Amino acid sequence: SYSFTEKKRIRKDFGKQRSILEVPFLLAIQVDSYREFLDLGLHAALKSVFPISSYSGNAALEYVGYKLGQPVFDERECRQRGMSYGAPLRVTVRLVIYDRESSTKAIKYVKEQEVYLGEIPLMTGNGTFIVNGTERVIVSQLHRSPGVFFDHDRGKTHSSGKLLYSARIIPYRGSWLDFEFDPKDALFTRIDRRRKLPVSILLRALGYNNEEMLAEFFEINTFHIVQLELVPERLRGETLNFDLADGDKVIVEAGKRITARHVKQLEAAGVAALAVPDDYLVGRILSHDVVDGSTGELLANANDEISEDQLTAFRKAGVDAVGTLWVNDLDRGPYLSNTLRIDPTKTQLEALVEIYRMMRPGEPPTKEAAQNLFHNLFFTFERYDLSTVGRMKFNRRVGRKDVLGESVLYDKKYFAERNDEESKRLVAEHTDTSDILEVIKVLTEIRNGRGVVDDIDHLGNRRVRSVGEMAENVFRVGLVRVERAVKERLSMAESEGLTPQELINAKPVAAAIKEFFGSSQLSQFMDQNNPLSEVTHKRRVSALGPGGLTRERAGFEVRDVHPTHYGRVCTIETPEGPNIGLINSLAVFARTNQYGFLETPYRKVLDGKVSDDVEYLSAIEENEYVIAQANALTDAKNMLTEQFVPCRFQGESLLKPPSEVHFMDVSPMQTVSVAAALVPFLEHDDANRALMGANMQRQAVPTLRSQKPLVGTGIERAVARDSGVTVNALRGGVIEQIDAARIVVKVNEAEIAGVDIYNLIKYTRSNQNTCINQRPLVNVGDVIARGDVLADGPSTDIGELALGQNMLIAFMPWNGYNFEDSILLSERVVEEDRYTTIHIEELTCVARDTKLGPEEISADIPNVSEQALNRLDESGVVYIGAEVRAGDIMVGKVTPKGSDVKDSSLRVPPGMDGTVIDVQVFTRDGIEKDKRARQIEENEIKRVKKDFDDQFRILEAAIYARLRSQIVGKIERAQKQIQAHEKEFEARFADKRGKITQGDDLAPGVLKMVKVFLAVKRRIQPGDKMAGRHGNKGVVSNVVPVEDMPYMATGESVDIVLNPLGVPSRMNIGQILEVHLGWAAKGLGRKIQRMLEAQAAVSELRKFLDDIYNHDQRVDLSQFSDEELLNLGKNLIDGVPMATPVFDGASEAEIKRMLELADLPQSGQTQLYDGRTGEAFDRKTTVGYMHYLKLNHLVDDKMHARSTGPYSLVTQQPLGGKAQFGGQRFGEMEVWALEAYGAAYTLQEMLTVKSDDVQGRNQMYKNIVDGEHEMVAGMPESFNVLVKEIRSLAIHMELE
Amino acid sequence: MGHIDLASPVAHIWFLKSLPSRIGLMLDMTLRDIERVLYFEAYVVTRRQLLTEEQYLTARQEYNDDFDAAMGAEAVYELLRTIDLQSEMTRLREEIASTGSETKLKRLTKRIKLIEAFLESGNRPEWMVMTVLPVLPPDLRPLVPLDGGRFATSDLNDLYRRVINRNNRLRRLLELNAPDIIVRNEKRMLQESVDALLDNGRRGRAIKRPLKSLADMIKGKQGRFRQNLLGKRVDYSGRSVITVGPYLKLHQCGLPKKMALELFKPFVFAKLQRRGLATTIKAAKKLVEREEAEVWDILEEVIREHPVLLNRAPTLHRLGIQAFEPVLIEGKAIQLHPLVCTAFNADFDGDQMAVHVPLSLEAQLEARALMMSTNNILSPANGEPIIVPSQDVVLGLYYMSRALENKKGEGMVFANTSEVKRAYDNRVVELHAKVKVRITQVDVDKRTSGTSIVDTTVGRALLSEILPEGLPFQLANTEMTKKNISRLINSSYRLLGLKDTVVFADKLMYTGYAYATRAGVSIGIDDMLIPDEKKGILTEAEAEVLEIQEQYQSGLVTAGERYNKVVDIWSRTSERIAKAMMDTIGTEKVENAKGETIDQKSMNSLYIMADSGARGSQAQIRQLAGMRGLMARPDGSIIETPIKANFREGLNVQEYFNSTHGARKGLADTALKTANSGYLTRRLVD
RNA sequence: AGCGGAGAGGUA
DNA sequence: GGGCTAATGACGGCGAATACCC
DNA sequence: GGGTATTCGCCGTGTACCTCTCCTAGCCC
Ligand SMILES: [Mg+2]
C-alpha cells in the first residue's frame, strides 16, 4: 500500500486468514463480451449468410472486410440531444457477375465503396447503452444449453411404475427433435411440438430398410432347419429353458436356469450347435426376410413371428439362414419391432408424403416438394446452425472421443446418395457416425441397459449468454432478412448498369436492432441512485426471456438452490416477492468460460501441502475431484493437521482423509455476491434476514454529507471503484490547477507532451430523479500516482463506500412508540442536516401546431395577475435560480381557439418547491430564436471559448516548460506539436460551434420544446421508511425534541431508539455485535480526539496507534512521515474504521479487547437515566453506533386524496394512480368484507352513486352542497355497456 | 349500433366449438363431420352423411340433376330449417322407449331435454346460424391519439375492417359470377374471419401477440365481469403510510390535514356557504387553496363525530374494513391504534391502506352501529377476542406481575391500592416484593361488596386499580402470560358487558406502555449464554461418530444404516444440547433468603421474551443458544453433517449453504400457499 | 385539451 | 428521408370420441 | 354388438400500490 489515497485513512482489518487472490473486475464480463463481439461474434454472422447464389441471373457477391466509423456525437452531448450513442457500420463487399451459357468466370470485379447498413449502439462508460438519452443495461440470460439430455416423468401417463423416458436434441436456433417412450412400449418422435409419429418414418426418410435397421441393434442367432448355434453368455441370467447337453454331458438339468457357475462350467466345456426342440423357436421373431434359393418367393418376410406354416416352408425350402432377435425380459426390449409392427409405410416416397402431410396441415402433398422440405429441416447450414457448444455437449453425452466436429447433423445413408460439393466434404472426414442411431442406442441403454439420468439443474447444462451473443442473434435475423431482400432485388441484374448500394437496405436491420435495444424483455431500465446498485444491476443473471421460462408458470424446482451454485451463483442477493429464485446474481470471483458456462477459481492442492496456484474449473469438472471446503485449519504456511477434513464430492458434504483432496477454495468471499458481502457479520444473522438486508441496501438515497460506516468489510474499495462513478488519474503527477468543476493534472516525464484535463459532472438528473455530483478532495501541489482517486461521487468517501450516517442506538421500549419495527428519532437528527437529500424533477412543455394555428410562448397571457408575471422574463421563460412555488407559472404558452386564446401554461406540481437550476431550449431549424435562446447560445459559446483557450494556454505553458527544460544547454518538435494542437483545438472549436448552432433533434410535428430543471430538498418527516444493513426495515414514528430523549452519564443524548423485540423473532444477532463494534470505534475516536486536542507529542500517539492497529495486518505508523501521522490522526476525529470480513470475521475476544482498550465498560452495556422524568432505570441497555441508510420509499409520492376527478369514456368510472387524479380501486374482497357485515346502504352508496352513475354522481354532490338528503338509486352505466356488448353477439338480452 | 349485411351465411362459434355442441345434438352428427362440412371440405345431400367430391361427381353422373347436395352454411341452414321438432320429439321418445343402452340413454335424455327447452322457449333452430351480424356502438371503444398526431391501434376495429373487406370481396365475386372454387375459398376465408372475430385463439389464433375479441374482453382476468362489475374504482379515497400512535383511543384514529381537506371538501364548501363567509363556490375554493386560518377551523368543526372507513388492500377476513372517528393531526401519515393492527395483520415496514369516506345519511349510521372498532371485539372464526396485548404490552405486564426471592420493602402490610401507589413512586419499596395488601372487590350473582386480605406482589396490586369490579382477583394473581391474559379478556367480556371491557383494554395498553418504558429491557451479547457442558457433549458425540465412521469404513455396517444411526445420535445430541441450554437459561439466576441461598426463575433478557410469549418458540431459543440440529435438503433427504454452532458463534460457508436450502424453500412455500389461499378463498366465497 | 394496451423493475 | 395506403422451461382436473379385446 | 381404455381438448392459476419506456408501418421515388 502506502499510496497517496491510502495514507489518509487506514482501517483495521480483522482478517486472520490469508488472501491468495485479490477481488477482480466486477463488470468485466459484459465489456469482455462486447469487445469479443466487435472469427467468432459478428464475423461469423457475416460470413454465414453473405454467400448468395442467384437462380437465373447467376449474380453472386462476397464481402471482404468491415470497418466501424467515428462516433459523431459524444455521450455527454448525446444525453442532452436525445439520440442514440451509435456508430456507423460500413461493410465493404465485392459484386461479381458470371457470364451465362459459358464457363464459371466473372466479368467485372466491381466493389461497393463502403455501403452503409445499420447502426450499433457502442458500449461506453461501464456498460450502459444510451438509446434515447437514458442509460439502458442488458442483463445476461440463463437458459438451457443446446445438446442432448434425458428425463423421465413421474406419474404422468397411466400411473404405472415403469417410468417412461424422453429425449430431446436441442439445437442453437432451428428445428427441435424429440424421442419419447409410451406405456404401450413404443417409441414416438415429434418435430417442433407437433403431432406424434413412429420412429420408423424418420428412419425410412433417412434411407434405411428394415433388414439393416433391426440387424445392427441386436445380435442374430443362426437357426438350421431346427438346430441353432449355442451363443455363449446368453442363457445366463435369462429365462430358463429345457435341458441342454454339450456332448451328452448335461451340467444343468430341466426346470433350472443357468447361474454364474453354470455359465462358467458351460464355457469351460466347448459348446457347439445343439439340437433345439421345435416348441422353442415359435415364440421368437425373424430378423430379415427368408426366401427360397430356387423359386425365390417371399415365403417369410422380415419382422414377423415364426409360426408352424413358416417353419414348414423354411424346412421345405432348405434355407439354413434363419436369424432371430435376442429378446430378454429386462436386459433386452423389443421396442423397435413394436414400432415397426404399427406403421404400414414401406417406401421412402410414402414416408416423405406422410412427413409433408404431418408438417403442412390441409395441404396436397408432392413427391418433389417433400424432398426439398426435408433437406432444409435437419441437414442444412442455413436453417439448423448447431453451434460448437452443442456439438461439445453431444460428444460429451453420447460418448464420442473427439470433441470438435461437424456443425450440422450427419447421417450415413442420407448423405451417401447426395453428389453435391458440400456433401463430399462431410463424408470424407466422418466415418458413418450415425448420430441419430447413437441417440436411439443411448436411449435404449437408458431404458434397459441401466444408464444414468441427469436432471436440468446444474451449471453444466445451463449456459450464460451475454449481450454479444444476443446482439449477434438479432443481427443474424436482420442479415437473413436483408439477404432475402437482396436476393429478390438482384435475382436478375446487369454487370455495371446498377449500383450495389441500391440492392441492400438498412431499414429492416435498423428496425430489428432498434426493436432489440429499445423495448425487449432483456433491456431493463437501470437505477443510477447508488454505485452499489449500478454495479449489482450489471452483474446480474436471470432466467426470464424469450428463450427461457416465464414467471407466471410454476417454477417450484427451479426456485430451489442446487449444490452446484456454491461458488458460481449467489444464494443471498435474490429479490423476494413474485420472482424469488428466478433472478439470481453472479458471485465475486465467478466469470464466464469460453463456451458460456460459469467457472470459479480453486487452488491446486498437492498431497502434502497447498500450492499458490489458481485453476478455473467448470461445473462438469467438479464432479470428479474432491474439493475441500473452508474448514481447513493450518499450522504452517501450507499444512493440514486434521485427520478428517470436510469436503464435497458431488454436492454431499462428507469426511475424507487429507491425502485424497485435489482442490480447495481460494477465498471465503466466494459464495456471496458484491451486494451481500458489504453487510458486516453475515455469518451471525439468518439467511432470510440477510436476503432482506441485501435488497434494503440496494435502494438507498445519497445524502448531502455522507459519512463512512464504522463497521465495514474492507472490500468496499473495489465496489465503488469498478462502478466508474469516480474519476481516476491515468498518469500521476503534479496538480497544477484545481476548481469546483475542473481538475488540471500535469503528466510527469516518466509516463509521458499534452497534459490531461478532467471535467467533473455537476448537479444533473439521474434515472430515478436523484441528484448526482462529484466533489474533488486533493489540493494544489500534490504528487499522485496512477490509479488513485481525485473526486468522490454521490454517496462516496475517500476511497471507501459510504451509504448513510451513523447515529446512536439504544435497544429499549420507549413509551410504545417502537411498537412493531418502528423507529423513534430526535430533534438533533433533523436540525443538523443529516438525512436531507436533493431530488431533481424534470418538467417539459412542448408547442406544436394544430389545424387552427401554431402556439407561441409570448408573455401577453390573459387572466394572469401580476403575482405570477414578475417571475417570467420577456421571452416567457422563468429566470434561472428563481424560487418557484407550487402552482405557479414557469413557461408561458397560449393556444388559439377562436384575441381569444386558451391558457396552456406549464404548471408546477403541488407540494414541490425549489429553485430552477438549468434551463434548456430545443429549437427547430428554420425558426428564429428568441432572447432566451440567444442568451443560452452566447453563454455556451463564451464557456466553450473559455475552456478552449484555457486548455490552449495550459498546453502552451506545458510546451514552453518542456522547451525551457531543454534549451538550458549550449526544439522544433515542440513548436510543431504546439501548432498541431492549435489546429486540433481550432477544428474542435469549429465542430463545437457547428454542433451548438445547429437545430437539435425534436419530435416530428412540434416547433419549440423547453425543459426546466427543478431542485427540491426532501426533509425527513413522520411516515418515512428507513432501514438498516442487518435487515431491520421499518417506518419512522415521531420527531421527539432532544430534551425528552434518554441520555448517558456523560451527557450524550441517544438519537434513535429501537425495539428489542425483533431479535428473537427474526433470529439475527449480528446487529447487536455491530452496535458494540461501533461503540468501540466511537470510543477510540473520542480518545484520539481527546489526545489530539491537547498539545501532546507524536511518540505517544504513535504508540497508541501501534497499540490499536496491530494487536497480539501488520502495519507501521512510522513509515509515511512525521506530519502524515498527525494528518491521519486529524482525519480520524470521528472514529477509526473497522473492517470485518464476511466469514473470516472477528470473535468476541477481539471486540472485548477493543472495548477494554478504551474507557468503555467490558460488557458493552451500561445504565442511562431517563429524559422524561430524570430517574434511573432498572436494567442496563446497549448503547452504540449503527450505520443506517435512507430508502427511496418516500411519503411524498405515496399519500394523495381526491373528491372530483376525471372519468373514462367506456365506463363512467374514475381513473387509477397518483398521477392524473386517480381514485383507489375498491377491491373484490372488500365488497365481500362489507357484505359480511350486512349494511346494504353503505354498499349501494359506495358502488352506484359514488362512481358509476352519470346522474347520481351529480345528484349526491348537489344534495351535499345544498343541504337536502334525497338520493336516487338506478342502474350503473357499466351494466348498460355490458348489455350493449352482449347484444352485439347475436344474443338477445333485455331487462325484463 | 349498426349491422352488416352478409351475402353468405355464417355459423356462430359458441354453439359449434363448445364441448356440449348443440348442433351435433340437433343434427345427430359428430363434431369432425360438421367441421369438415362447414369449412367446405365435404358435401351434404338432402340422408345425412359425409360425402366427398368424387362421390358427388359419380352421384351426379347417375342421378341426372335429381339429387341435389349443398356444401357450406346453406346445407346446415336447410337442415335446421326443414326439420319439425314436434314430430322429432315423439320420434326420439320412441327411440328412448326402444333403445336401452346406458350412454345411448344419456344422449337420448340430453337430446330430449334440449328439444323440450327449444320448444318451451319458442326459439327456432335456424337461429344458430346467422345472416345479419351486428356491430358494437362506436362510443364503446375509443381511438386514443398519441403524442405527435398519431393514433393508437385497436383490436376489434381491425377484425371489423377485415370482415367488411371479405364481405365486399365476396359480394363482388358473387355479382361478377366467379367460378365456384374461388367462391368456396372466399366463403371459407369469411367463415374463418368471422370465427376469429367471435372467439380469437380457439381455431387458428389469427394475430406476435394475439389481439383480443368479443369473447376475450369478457371471459378471463381482464374481462368486464371482474374489472367493471364487481370491483370498481371509487372516489373519496386515498392511501397513506401507517404509523403507530399511542396517545389515541381505540375508537378513534389519526388523519393528515391535507387529506382531510381534500376528502371533506364538499362539506367544507357547504359549511362556508352556511356560515356566509363565501358567496360562491369559486371564492370558497380560492379561499381553501389560499390556505387561510378559518379553513382549518371549518375543517375541525365539520368532522367531530363523522366516521370514516379504513381498509388494508390485502384483506383476508371480514375484519379488514373497520370504522373510526378521525382527528386532525400533523404530518403525512395516518395514525392507528396498536390494538387494531392485530386484526389487520399490518406490520409497520411501509404498509399502505386506502381510506373511504361514507357521505350518505344512512352510511354513517351503518358504519357507526355495526362497523365501529368498539363492536368488532370477537373474531368470526372462534370465540376468542381479537383485543390481545401485543409484543410491547405483554412484556411489561410479565415484568410487572412476577416475584423474586428477596427484595427491598417486603414483609410490610399495606392498606389499599392507593397506599401502594403512594409508596411506589418515591422509591421506598421495590416493583416486586412479597407483601400482604388488603383489597375490596364486589360479588355478582346483583352487587355484593366484600373486603378480604390476600398475599401478592406490588405489581399485581398496582394492576388491581384498572380492572373492573366484576373480575375477581384470583383471575389476575397469576403471572400475566399470553394465554392467561387472553382468558382474562374473555372472562371480562363474558359476564360483564362491552363498554367496561373496551375501557379496560384502553387502560391496560397504557399501563403496559408506562411500565415497559420504566423497565428498559435490552438483549445483548452478555445476556445470551452458552451451556458449559456443550463442548464436552460435542466432543463425546464427535468421538462417537468417529468410532461409527471407523466401524463403517472397516467393512461391517452398510452406508444406509450407518447414515441412519449417525443422524439418530446427532438428533439425540441436539435434544441433549437443547435440554442443557434450557436448564442453564431458566435456572441461571440465584438469590439468598435470610442468608440461605435459594433457586428461582431467571430474569434474563432472552428468557423473559421466551416465557412471556409474543416471540419465537423454544426452537428459536435453541437456534440462538445451542446447535440448530440437522437441516434438510430440497429433494427430501437429511444432510449427514450437523451445524455444531449457534448464531452467537461464527459460521462457515458450509453450514450457511446448508441453511440456505431450508431458508429459500420456506419463502417459496409461503408464496405458493398465499396464491393457493387466494384461489381457495375465491372459490369458497363463490 | 380529458380517456388505451403491452414490456421491465420494487414495497406489502 | 417521405406521404398517403393499405414459439419448444407449465401442471393438474374433467368431459367427449374412437376403438379394441371380448 | 359392447363396455370401458387410453386420448384429445377445454378450463383455471390472490389482492392492491409506485416508477420507467413504447406503441400501425412501409415503400419506391
Ligand atoms: Mg407489512
Residue numbers in the entry:
A (entry chain C): 3 to 40, 51 to 237, 243 to 769, 775 to 920, 940 to 1011, 1052 to 1193, 1199 to 1382
B (entry chain D): 102 to 147, 156 to 316, 321 to 558, 563 to 803
What does the paper say about this structure?
The structures reveal a unique binding site (the RNA-exit channel) of the phage protein P7 on bacterial host RNAP, where P7 exerts dual regulatory activities on host RNAP—inhibiting transcription initiation and preventing transcription termination.
In this study, we determined a cryo-EM structure of Xoo transcription elongation complex with P7 (P7-TEC) at 3.95 Å and a cryo-EM structure of Xoo transcription elongation complex with P7 and NusA (P7-NusA-TEC) at 3.41 Å. The overall structures of RNAP and the interactions between P7 and RNAP are essentially the same in the two structures. P7 makes interactions with the β′dock, β′ZBD, as well as βCTR, all of which are structural elements required for σ704 to anchor RNAP core enzyme.
